[PDB]
Write a protein that binds this DNA or RNA. Structure first.
Ligand SMILES: [Mg+2]
Ligand SMILES: [Mg+2]
Ligand SMILES: [Mg+2]
Ligand SMILES: [Mg+2]
Ligand SMILES: [Mg+2]
Ligand SMILES: [Mg+2]
Ligand SMILES: [Mg+2]
Ligand SMILES: [Mg+2]
Ligand SMILES: [Mg+2]
Ligand SMILES: [Mg+2]
Ligand SMILES: [Mg+2]
Ligand SMILES: [Mg+2]
Ligand SMILES: [Mg+2]
Ligand SMILES: [Mg+2]
Ligand SMILES: [Mg+2]
Ligand SMILES: [Mg+2]
Ligand SMILES: [Mg+2]
Ligand SMILES: [Mg+2]
Ligand SMILES: [Mg+2]
Ligand code: NA
Ligand code: NA
Lengths: 218, 129, 208, 142, 103, 33, 73, 84, 71
RNA sequence: AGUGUGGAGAUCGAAGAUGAUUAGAAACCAUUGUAGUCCACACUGCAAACGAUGACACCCAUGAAUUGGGGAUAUCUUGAAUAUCCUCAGCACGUACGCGAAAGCUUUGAGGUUACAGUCUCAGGGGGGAGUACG
RNA sequence: UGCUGUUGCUGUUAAAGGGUUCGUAGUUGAACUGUGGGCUGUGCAGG
């Protein structure tokens, strides 16, 4: 049973927040993973384990082995999240990484290569994400090319909802902890790029907590 | 020494836009710099700008709105036939939906879309988006 | 922020509160200055110290008071003081405006450790000196919380949004400015009136 | 400064934007040209002539009053230096350096500076030969 | 791996080329004068008890007239400075602390 | 300290060895010539 | 509380700048009246009337006992 | 405002806040971007229902230039007087 | 860093020609020393006559007698 | 450092001598000492010859300093110096973007680069063999 | 295989800036000669 501990969790439980778009718009952090389970419909948040590998810390008698788990979450329709957690046992790491992945969900802007008919199918502009030595570059592609990418970025992009994209990589891509995060940062950056379609000014609106301050007072 | 006035000006503009300034001083100026600025202005990427006369190569103060992501010069000014526009857009522009390659042509300095409409080639000056 | 939509000067400085600013030494500026506070300084005096012009000081005080008054729930505004000379002024401001408060050492994780109890999620933060209240300001920058600060001349203005140039060290100056902020905020509400001078006496606003 | 060394000094004149002579300057252009020629006839190069006119006679710029630069006036009157002024001064410096090095054969720093001065002399002589301000076969003799 | 931004010496990249060495006060090792550890020592000639005994026997020295001191500028090589504990290895964060006056 | 692990002996003495080797080879060939 | 305009700077900012760092460069020097002669403020060529001024590294020093008036432009 | 098909549908997932000071899009994970509500004052000192809200991008906060930007905003919006 | 001039083609051509020799594979492909030293003379296979059967000990940490022939 | 020819030859000191230490000690330590160390003239052209960071040019945040020259307007000696501010040029220091595998760098870039183009130039392409062999 | 790199590499510590200058082919090289004007209609032009 979920008993919220933050104001945003209380507003989500009270149903006065109906989408993740409202949280994204005001840049509010998500501290309880149940918010994402609530705001995304049943059976529409796909998860997957991306990589599990051991890490060792040397000790005066041998070494201590823990496990790092990387989890991807997404609705295949413009929302993606990456979680990475360490645990003494594999199952603990997997569960914690699923929760962390749900916590780190982000919007992905999708666009068109040429003519704008149908749903957006590709990224709206060239983007690059870097983590360590690994950099992943996403290039818009026409319809029908699919995801021309290595398997790990391919899986992440599939969970993000991108159908056609050219991809280039550099650095030590076998460092998969860095590759996953580099792809995530490339995707997260699609909504920060100012396009002529976003030149028109916006009316600033009050935050959910501002408008439901009295409700959260009780 | 300074070898390209246009490259210097466009690097200055890109630095000022990257650091969030609203005005930038350009020095020295030339006719080609003014035409490039006017091409950027025609598409709304910069605001109003003023040419200061010093009886020398002048100075320009450009008013920057937040629309300009990056502008830069292409050196050397490569030849571009009418069939090379797609290649340059693929190579140097963020997408086919926006952004411009600026060219100098015998019909004058213009962006790539207007040049393709006039069916003229020329030398590539730079880009902005 | 004395300008209003109607053009009235109801919120301008009445010269009946200015001599209080001059009286409690609210302009002496620690002989040190920062780039962000170059604007609020009028000049350098004898003995090598800076003075804060009172026009901009009062304008920012009005802006902060109006921002505080825009909050429907006074408990949504937390006011903090790591320095000991602000604790009593903090208590008095809170007990007269309804704002939350906390003095002394700031416990890290207060605004970010959700599951720890004593974890609070204020909407606005008011601090007495951004240098000494640095930890609260650092925590606020992780949770979308704007910061109002009483800033001296050498104030690091990193995550402060409304800086009030003042004297951050004198007991009398801190008490005077907090009393002024409380009075102005209560005047923006209907609780007191402009014509009648406030009954509250400011000597007990000082610490110990 | 920049040529031959790490000097990056910026000191120089800043000519005024308003080019018209001051109203209190009541010397006619022909008299200024006469002054320039008289100074040249007393063995003064254009730099020194301009400096005397600026210091003692209130003539900030000869070109702004007469419309002509000082070396142009000297050329029109047959008074221009046989070899250009800057080249003359560089050759004089090189000659003095060589005279000093005749006795001081271990002043290696002066030998270095002499190499720099002679390279400068050759680059300038090349320029002046190209613009026909020097004869062909003009030779710098050490 | 560069341990120090100054490379253990007071000689910035474009300040000067060569600084003439000096002999270590202790071992004689030649050390660039900028790099060496320099201390100026003002030392009493006798300790307090010897000073009292000598002042008791002196018409010159007493409460009115101080006894002379020793003055020495001592420059050490790094090994001798460390060994005599005039300077010690410090934690990485504390290595940047510089004292300009005697304390 | 002040250096990383060499492949064999101290490089300056290895260079001195190769120097003595070259001098000996030069002497040998000047003998045969 | 006023944003500076690069095209129209304040006199306080422009007064501080080096003569070639100004928005439009220009001289620091002037002419002065000291018969009455005209002397450059930065004369170095031993101006005479008796010497009227002494050359230095910057502005020449006018000799004591003679009156000096700065000229326009 | 945003992307559209040829059919006229708005296909952007959401329209992010564009800061009035920096003219940059506020990201979902900015977490230092803030919104400040500055109250409107009537003929007298009493506060009415309506309020003015302004957004500051998080990087502007991180660089210590947020107070300056809010000053210029309140000068532009008529909230705060430019001079005496 | 590299030269960029519009008429600087000769410098780039000479530079690439010189530096192509540093690639070990390219150098082996464009020289005769490997083909000369190669017992097969550049062929994929070669016929030979068995001289003797020999046993070659495997390298550490393995331990075996690898059966070979001298041909 | 080394080479040649003259000179010098106090000090220190490769070679060497003697005494210790040691299992041995051709070492470290002690006492010495040749060549050298110094000068003129002529060679040699190698250094962790280092900022292990090529040269020229542009932009670039903050505070306290420092060297030289200028500009404007409190103290001390009798012009010099000092004070406040500004300025050009120089060697740097502390705490912003941004960058980097990190250590770190940061108007003194290693920043302004996959959003990859100011100019010229040198070098590198797994470790050894080897800066060896041959010319 | 962006491990030959024009597109498109690396050179503080991983391989790699020449000890420092001078300098000839070579490469590269600052501005400037230049807003065409009137007339009617038409356009979320704008102050
Ligand atoms: Mg050292
Ligand atoms: Mg020097
Ligand atoms: Mg050296
Ligand atoms: Mg030292
Ligand atoms: Mg060690
Ligand atoms: Mg070490
Ligand atoms: Mg090494
Ligand atoms: Mg020798
Ligand atoms: Mg001797
Ligand atoms: Mg001896
Ligand atoms: Mg031993
Ligand atoms: Mg001995
Ligand atoms: Mg190799
Ligand atoms: Mg490589
Ligand atoms: Mg290197
Ligand atoms: Mg390196
Ligand atoms: Mg190396
Ligand atoms: Mg050499
Ligand atoms: Mg040269
Ligand atoms: Na085995
Ligand atoms: Na070094």
């Amino acid at each position: 049973e979920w008993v919220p501990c933050t104001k945003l969790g209380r507003l989500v439980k009270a149903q006065k927040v109906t989408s993740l778009e409202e949280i994204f718009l005001f840049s509010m952090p998500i501290k309880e993973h149940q918010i994402v389970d609530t705001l995304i419909a049943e059976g529409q948040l796909h998860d997957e384990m991306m990589k599990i590998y051991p890490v060792q810390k040397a000790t005066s008698a041998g070494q201590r082995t823990r496990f790092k788990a990387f989890n991807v979450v997404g609705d295949c329709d413009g929302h993606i999240g990456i979680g990475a957690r360490v645990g003494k046992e594999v199952s603990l790491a997997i569960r914690a990484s699923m929760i962390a992945a749900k916590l780190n969900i982000v919007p992905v802007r999708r666009g068109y290569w040429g003519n704008k008919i149908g749903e957006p199918h590709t990224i709206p502009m060239k983007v690059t994400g870097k983590c360590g030595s690994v950099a992943v570059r996403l290039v818009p592609a026409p319809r029908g090319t699919g995801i021309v990418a290595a398997p790990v970025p391919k899986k992440i992009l599939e969970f993000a909802g991108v159908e056609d994209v050219y991809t280039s990589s550099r650095g030590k891509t076998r460092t998969h902890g860095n590759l996953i995060m580099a792809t995530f940062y490339a995707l997260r950056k699609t909504y920060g790029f100012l396009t002529p379609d976003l030149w028109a000014d916006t009316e600033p609106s009050r935050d959910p907590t501002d408008e439901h301050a009295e409700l959260l007072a009780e | 020494t300074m070898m390209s006035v246009l490259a210097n000006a466009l690097r200055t503009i890109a630095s000022a836009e990257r650091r969030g300034k609203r005005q930038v001083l350009i020095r020295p100026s030339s006719k080609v710099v003014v035409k490039f600025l006017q091409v950027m202005q025609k598409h709304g990427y910069i605001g109003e700008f003023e040419i200061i006369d010093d009886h020398r190569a002048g100075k320009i103060v450009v008013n920057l709105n937040g629309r300009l992501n990056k502008c830069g010069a292409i050196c050397p000014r490569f030849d571009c036939a009418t069939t090379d526009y797609e290649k340059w857009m693929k190579n140097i522009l963020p997408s086919r939906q926006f952004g411009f390659v600026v060219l100098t042509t015998s019909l004058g300095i213009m962006d790539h879309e207007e040049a393709r409409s006039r069916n003229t080639g020329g030398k590539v000056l730079g880009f902005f988006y | 922020m004395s300008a209003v939509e109607s053009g009235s000067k109801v919120l301008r400085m009445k010269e009946s509160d200015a001599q209080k600013l001059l009286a409690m030494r609210c302009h002496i500026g620690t002989r040190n200055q920062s780039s962000a506070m170059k604007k609020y300084i009028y000049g350098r005096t004898a003995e090598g110290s800076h003075i804060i012009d009172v026009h901009m000081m009062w304008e920012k005080l009005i802006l902060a008071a109006r921002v505080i008054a825009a909050v429907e729930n006074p408990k949504d505004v937390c006011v903090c003081s790591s320095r000991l000379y602000g604790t009593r002024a903090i208590y008095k401001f809170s007990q007269h405006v309804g704002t939350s408060f906390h003095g002394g050492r700031f416990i890290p994780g207060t605004f970010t450790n959700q599951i720890q109890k004593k974890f609070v999620q204020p909407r606005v933060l008011v601090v007495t000196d951004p240098r000494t209240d640095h930890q609260a300001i650092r925590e606020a920058s992780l949770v979308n919380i704007p910061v109002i600060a009483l800033c001296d001349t050498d104030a690091p203005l990193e995550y402060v949004d409304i800086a009030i140039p003042c004297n951050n060290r004198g007991i009398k100056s801190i008490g005077m400015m907090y009393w002024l902020l409380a009075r102005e905020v209560l005047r923006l509400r209907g609780t007191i009136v402009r014509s009648v001078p406030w009954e509250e006496k400011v000597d007990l606003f000082f610490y110990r | 400064v920049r040529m031959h060394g790490n000097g990056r000094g910026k000191a120089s004149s800043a000519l005024p934007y308003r080019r018209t002579p001051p109203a209190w300057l009541k010397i006619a252009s022909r008299n200024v040209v006469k002054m320039v020629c008289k100074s040249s006839r007393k063995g003064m190069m254009p730099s020194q002539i301009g400096m005397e006119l600026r210091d003692s006679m209130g003539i900030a710029q000869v070109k702004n009053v007469t419309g002509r630069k000082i070396l142009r006036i000297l050329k029109h009157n047959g008074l221009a230096p046989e070899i250009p002024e800057d080249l003359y001064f560089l050759v004089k410096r090189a000659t003095q350096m060589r005279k000093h090095l005749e006795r001081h054969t271990t002043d290696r720093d002066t030998k270095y500076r002499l190499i720099l001065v002679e390279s400068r002399i050759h680059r300038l002589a090349r320029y002046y030969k190209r613009v026909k301000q020097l004869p062909p076969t003009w030779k710098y003799e050490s | 791996t560069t341990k120090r931004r100054n490379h253990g010496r007071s000689k910035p990249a474009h300040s000067r080329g060569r600084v003439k060495p000096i002999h270590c006060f202790n071992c004689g090792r030649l050390t660039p004068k900028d790099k060496a550890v320099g201390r100026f020592v003002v030392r009493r000639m006798l300790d307090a008890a010897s000073a009292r005994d000598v002042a008791e026997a002196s018409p010159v020295y007493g409460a009115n007239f101080p006894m002379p001191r020793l003055y020495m500028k001592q420059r050490f090589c790094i090994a001798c400075a460390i060994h005599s504990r005039t300077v010690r290895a410090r934690p990485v964060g504390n290595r940047k602390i510089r004292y300009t006056k005697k304390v | 300290g002040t250096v990383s692990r060499p492949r064999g002996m101290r490089p300056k003495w290895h260079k001195k060895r190769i120097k003595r080797l070259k001098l000996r080879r030069r002497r040998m060939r000047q003998r045969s010539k | 509380f006023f944003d500076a305009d690069l095209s129209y700077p304040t006199v306080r900012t422009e007064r501080m700048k080096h003569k070639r760092r100004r928005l439009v460069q220009g001289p620091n020097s002037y002419f002065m009246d000291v018969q009455v002669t005209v002397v450059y403020s930065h004369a170095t060529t031993s101006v005479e009337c008796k010497k009227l001024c002494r050359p230095t590294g910057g502005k020449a020093l006018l000799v004591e006992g003679c009156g000096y008036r700065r000229k326009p432009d | 405002i945003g992307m559209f098909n040829e059919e006229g549908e708005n296909v952007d997932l959401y329209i992010p806040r564009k800061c009035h000071a920096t003219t940059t899009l506020i990201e979902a994970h900015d977490h230092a971007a803030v919104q400040i509500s500055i109250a409107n004052v009537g003929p007298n000192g009493v506060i009415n229902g309506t309020t003015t809200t302004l957004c500051i991008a998080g990087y502007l906060r991180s660089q210590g230039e947020s107070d300056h930007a809010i000053n210029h905003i309140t000068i532009d919006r008529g909230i705060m007087r430019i001079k005496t | 860093t590299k030269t960029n001039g519009q008429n600087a083609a000769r410098k780039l051509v000479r530079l690439r020609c010189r530096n192509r020799w540093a690639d070990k594979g390219w150098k082996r492909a464009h020289t005769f020393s490997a083909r000369k030293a190669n017992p097969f003379g550049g062929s994929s296979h070669a016929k030979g006559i068995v001289l003797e059967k020999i046993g070659v000990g495997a390298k550490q940490p393995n331990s075996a007698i690898r059966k070979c022939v001298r041909v």
